[PDB]
Amino acid sequence: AFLNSLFMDFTSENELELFLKSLDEVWSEDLYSRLSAAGLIRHVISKVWNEQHRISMVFEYDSKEGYQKCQEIIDKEFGITLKEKLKKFVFKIHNNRGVVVSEFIRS
Amino acid sequence: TDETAFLNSLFMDFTSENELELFLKSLDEVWSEDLYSRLSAAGLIRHVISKVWNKEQHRISMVFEYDSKEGYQKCQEIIDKEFGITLKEKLKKFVFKIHNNRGVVVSEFIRS
């Protein structure tokens, strides 16, 4: 129903790599338990081959209320809870929030 | 459960909303279940098309997920053989640049 296709751009490859090797601390099991129960269907994190030190994150929600409930959780998670923990990384976020027009899913 | 190894999170920006709406209304001509059946056998796991809510742009996002990068390339071959001069010329009516973002999946969470 809803999907945020987000990109995180870092100032260096070393920053990107430390972040990727530190994922279980940022996107913890506890956080996923909460987001899961609030509407989160999937979350994929991938590298982006490039000039750019870019990370792609695609989030899929079962509804908009799902998206919003999870976003609040996420907004608080990084904007407040992990704020001081994430200052070691300088990065820029590009969000792409949208309603799903069509979807294909293999058997 | 299909694990995604390779992914493209691409986006397209149009010079007008009417053009975006027309492009959306022409996707069923492209992404037929017939084509999807053959691409899915070649490694396409998932394909999601979305209308981005952004007041500054007229944007469409697409996320293609593959079981492997080899699957991605076989799917590119299939797409090449699927369309020709008729699509080529339909796309000449539009103006947008595709922003691709391809790479290896590092982490995947799927619910339950």
CB-CB under 8 Å, A43 with B108: yes
The C-alpha atoms of residue B53 and residue B60 are separated, in whole angstroms, by 9
* B31 touching A (Cβ < 8 Å): yes
In a domain, A105, yes or no: no
Contacts of B105 (CB under 8 A, 6+ apart): A44, A45, A46, B3, B4, B5, B6, B7
In a domain, A67, yes or no: yes
A6 and A54 in contact (C-beta within 8 Å)? no
Find the CATH number of the domain harbouring A95: 3.30.70.100
CB-CB under 8 Å, B49 with A102: yes
* B59 touching A (Cβ < 8 Å): yes
CB-CB under 8 Å, A32 with B109: yes
CB-CB under 8 Å, B31 with A104: yes
What tokens does B99 get? 């922003």
B45 and B68 in contact (C-beta within 8 Å)? no
* A94 touching B (Cβ < 8 Å): no
In a domain, A26, yes or no: yes
B104 and B24 in contact (C-beta within 8 Å)? no
Count CA atoms closer than 13 A to B76's CA, side-chain side.
7
Burial class (CB in 10 A: 0-12, 13-18, 19+), B96: middle
* B98 touching A (Cβ < 8 Å): no
Mutate to test the interface with A, among B9, B13, B72, B100 (most CBs of A within 10 A): B9
* Count of residues making up chain B: 112
The C-alpha atoms of residue A10 and residue A14 are separated, in whole angstroms, by 9
In a domain, B52, yes or no: yes
In a domain, B78, yes or no: yes
First to last CA, chain B: 11
Contacts of A41 (CB under 8 A, 6+ apart): A60, A61, A62, B110, B111
Q: Which of A48, A96, A107 sits opposite B11 (nearest CB)?
A: A96
In a domain, B112, yes or no: no
In a domain, B86, yes or no: yes
Method in brief:
X-ray
Q: How many domains is chain A partitioned into structurally? A: 1
* A89 touching B (Cβ < 8 Å): no
In a domain, A106, yes or no: no
The C-alpha atoms of residue A95 and residue B74 are separated, in whole angstroms, by 30
Mutate to test the interface with A, among B3, B8, B65, B111 (most CBs of A within 10 A): B111
- Domain range spanning residue A30? 1-100
The C-alpha atoms of residue B19 and residue B21 are separated, in whole angstroms, by 5
* B9 touching A (Cβ < 8 Å): yes
The C-alpha atoms of residue B78 and residue B70 are separated, in whole angstroms, by 13
A42 and A60 in contact (C-beta within 8 Å)? yes
A36 and B111 in contact (C-beta within 8 Å)? yes
B110 and A45 in contact (C-beta within 8 Å)? no
Q: What is the CA radius of gyration of chain A?
A: 14
